[PDB]
Structures are given as C-alpha cells and as structure tokens.
Ligand binder design. Structure first.
Ligand SMILES: O=C(CCCC[C@@H]1SC[C@@H]2NC(=O)N[C@@H]21)Nc1ccc([N+](=O)[O-])cc1
Ligand SMILES: O=C(CCCC[C@@H]1SC[C@@H]2NC(=O)N[C@@H]21)Nc1ccc([N+](=O)[O-])cc1
Ligand SMILES: O=C(CCCC[C@@H]1SC[C@@H]2NC(=O)N[C@@H]21)Nc1ccc([N+](=O)[O-])cc1
Ligand SMILES: O=C(CCCC[C@@H]1SC[C@@H]2NC(=O)N[C@@H]21)Nc1ccc([N+](=O)[O-])cc1
Lengths: 120, 120, 120, 120
C-alpha cells in the first residue's frame, strides 16, 4: 500500500511533510518550496488535502496556502509503489496568482509537474 | 469582500456548498457534479480547501474526493466582486484519474476551467 | 461539417483569421490578441496549425508566434456545430514565457481556455 | 544558440525529428510516440510548429496531427543550452481528444510534460 504520511522531496528540491491521514483520507502538512517569484520571502506553508483510502495506489489532491504570497497552489496525482516497495508521487499542479481584477484573470494560472520521493 | 461560504453553481451545471471559512482560511463542503465518466453513478462528494483570509478578492484551492470514482479533482482560482457586488469564482481544475502503474501516468491528468456564480 | 477557415473572435475579445485548410489539414493565419503582459506593445502575430480533415467536428492545434514578445502560445480544441449550424471552437491553451535558464522553467507556462465564435 | 532541427527523444521514449527551421521560425517534422490509448495503432505522425529565431534559447510551439487517432497534441516549451553546450527542450503539452458533442467537451483535454534531449 502506497502511503502519503511522512516527508517527501521533489525534483525542484522542495520538501513537504504530510501528517496522519484520517479515515476519510484527509491530511494536513507543511510545504517548504525551493523556488518562488521572490525566494527571499519563502516561509514554511500549510497544506490540506484528501487521498483515497481503500486504494493501494491512491489518487489525491492538496492545496498549499503560501504564507508569504497571495497566490495558492493545488497539486493532484497518484502514489505508485513499485515491485521493490519504492514509492513515487507523480503530480501536476496549478499555481493561481492574485490579480487586481477580472480583466487580468486570463494570465493568473500557471501549470507544471512534480515528482516526489521519500526523504528517507 | 468576496466570500466563498455559500451555494454555487458552475457553467456545466454542477453545484457546491461551502461551509464557514475558519481563521486560517480553511473550509469544507459538498460537491455535486453534473457530469462524470459514468453519470449514472454520481454521488455527493466532499471538498476541502484553503483560501486567503485577508484579501478582498482571495485566491483559493480545494480538493474534491469523488465518492463514486477513484479519481480526484483539484480546483484553484480567485473570487472577484464587480461594482454591483456580484461574485464570480474564476477557476482552473485538474482531474486525476487512477491508472495501473507509472507507465500509464502520462494520460492520467485532465485540465479544464469553470466559472461559478452564487445560487440566489 | 465544422470549418476553421474564416474570421473568429474569442471570449477575451481577441480575433483571428484562418486561411484555407489544405489536404493535410494544415493552415496559417493571423492572430490579434486583445490582452498581453504589455498591451501597448501588441502586434499582429502569425499562427500555424493542423486540423483533422475528414471529421465533421475536427480536433486541431495551432501555434501563435507572438511578434512583440519572446513568448509562444499553443491552442488545441475541437470545432462543434449545433443544430442550427452555429460553430464554436472550444479550446485550451498554454502560454510559454521565455526564462533565463532551466532553473526558472517551473514558472514559465500559463494555462487557460478560450471559446471562439465566427465573426458574422 | 539552442537549435531545434534534428532528432530528439523524450522521457517516455518517444522520438521526433525536426527538419529545417525557416527564416520565420517555422518547422515541420515527424513524431513517433512511444505511448497512446491504443499503442497497437501507432504510426509516424506529422508535426508543424514555430520557434523564435533571434533568441539563443527560443520558446516554440508545435502541433502533432496523429495519423492513427482523431486526437491532436500541442507542445510548447523552451530550448535551453547549458554551459557545456548540451541542449534540453523543456515542454508541456495538451492532448485534445475527439468527443461526440459539446456536452462531453469538459473531459476532452489532457495535460502533461516532456523533457527532450538530442538522440546523438
Ligand atoms: O512563487 C509563488 C509561491 C510559491 C510557489 C512554488 C511553486 S508550487 C509549484 C512548484 N513546485 C514547487 O515545489 N514549487 C513551485 N507564487 C507566485 C509565482 C509567480 C507569480 N507571478 O506573477 O508570476 C506570482 C506568485
Ligand atoms: O468523472 C469523474 C469524477 C467527476 C469529475 C467531474 C469534473 S471535475 C471538473 C469538471 N467540473 C465539474 O463541475 N465537473 C467536472 N472522474 C473520472 C472521469 C474519467 C475517467 N477516465 O478514466 O476516463 C476516470 C475518472
Ligand atoms: O502577453 C504575451 C503574448 C500574448 C498572449 C495572449 C494570450 S494567448 C492565451 C490568451 N488568449 C488570447 O486571446 N490572448 C491570451 N506573453 C507574455 C505574457 C506574460 C509574460 N510574463 O513574463 O509574465 C511573458 C510573455
Ligand atoms: O493516444 C493518443 C495519441 C498519441 C498521444 C501521445 C501523447 S502526446 C503527449 C505525450 N508525449 C508523448 O511523447 N506521447 C504522449 N490519443 C488519445 C489518448 C487518450 C484518449 N482518451 O480518450 O482517453 C484519446 C486519444
């Protein structure tokens, strides 16, 4: 069974820590991004998400509320466990920036990927 | 100030309720999608997210754990208010399907938009 | 049969012309965006794409080489025709900005939607 | 200067071949995908795109008209050259499937990434 609780790094060097997953699949955690628009401002930020519970290789999603920006990121993906028991989170994300009014809405959403593996 | 708490509909005819937003910007709710891969199977599904608390037109994200599928959707966007006080959530989403192993990961993520308005 | 050749406008107020589609489904045209990072700089920009030729409601893609920026957009979508013969292009796009090196790549891709209808 | 003409592989094992880039930045080529919904049907497929010409690390886009499917993919990205002259294409893509009518449009667009390096 592919589990999400614990510490993970991604391909950009970011670190996240996920706490206990409850019986609904809900989890909280923290996210330390390696990169930002203004990296001098980066602070540890909270995340909240839900995974599927029954599945051995669950899909999941989470939201990161950046504590140093008006932006928000959401990640979704799947936890895969390979034949040797190694886990990988394959994810894609949307990063929503804050714009001044709806005329700027079109430029406010970035997309990308991240692959996560366990810290230890 | 653009508020997320309440009842919303989107351009596909889906509806959602969002409950009270706490001091950290966290919220729960319930999502009824109008569409699915198998629409005959649709059940009400929980959502969990975070918005920015201080901003007049906050960015936010939330995860929907579909209760009738192994998939998960994340939404992110911004709440805008026009001159007459009418709110719109401008959002982008990623829908993650469950695939068998990492070699199928490439086809597992759909993307789209949704615009939400308040019901009454 | 839903045809791409002609003059189109989208929900942001941008317009494009698409020229004749050849036997391979290839087409050129000209795009006038209503919006940019720097709207004072906007110039007409060429597009180049391919549609499926046989399909009544073809999928397609095209690239816009912005003539006033180092960025590029790609659009993909499908041409639908309703019962009265009215066409709509339902599209999704990626806007790639130029960044200095690979360490900035994560923030270089925006995503969004556009719905196009025929001008007259 | 980061050039696109030549043969490339990506992280999924796909191969593409780009021909001469003209003075406008337009190029054609072929794409042999390693993966598909129905891999038994895969055939070499044409692509058409545009890159920026002046830039040492140009952004670009291209469309692949799959010759074995009603779907279309668009790719956009940037060509980076590192301190040793090694080139990488960092891309993201949208894959548009053909659906029967507009009520299914919401599920028709997949998103993902690909990193390309030169075959030789
Ligand atoms: O910089 C920020 C906030 C931090 C985002 C980090 C992103 S989350 C996706 C990716 N995966 C990671 O591990 N880290 C990165 N927000 C921001 C960025 C750009 C703009 N902008 O206007 O361009 C505005 C806000
Ligand atoms: O059908 C599902 C679950 C429901 C998704 C509803 C989407 S959320 C984005 C959009 N906005 C809405 O209000 N409703 C739609 N999942 C699913 C679909 C296809 C496949 N598949 O394998 O093809 C697997 C799971
Ligand atoms: O502004 C630009 C070039 C023009 C992009 C217009 C986009 S295409 C998707 C959407 N549909 C339309 O009809 N129009 C918009 N590029 C750009 C923007 C921002 C940055 N940046 O660094 O922030 C760099 C280049
Ligand atoms: O399978 C197809 C056509 C081939 C697409 C190959 C994709 S292009 C992005 C990625 N990078 C690669 O090098 N190769 C893959 N189309 C398709 C897929 C799924 C569905 N579907 O309905 O699920 C319909 C058509």
């Amino acid at each position: 069974k592919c589990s999400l609780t614990g510490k993970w790094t991604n391909n950009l060097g970011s670190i996240m820590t996920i706490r206990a997953v409850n019986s609904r699949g809900e989890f909280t955690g923290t996210y330390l991004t390696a990169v930002a628009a203004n990296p001098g401002n980066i602070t540890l930020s909270p995340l909240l998400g839900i995974q599927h519970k029954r599945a051995s290789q669950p899909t999941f999603g989470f939201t990161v509320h950046w504590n140093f920006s008006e932006s928000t990121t959401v990640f979704t993906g799947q936890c895969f466990i390979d034949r040797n028991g190694k886990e990988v989170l394959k994810t894609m994300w949307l990063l929503r920036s804050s714009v001044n009014d709806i005329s700027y809405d079109w430029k406010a959403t970035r997309v990308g990927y991240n692959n996560f593996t366990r810290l230890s």
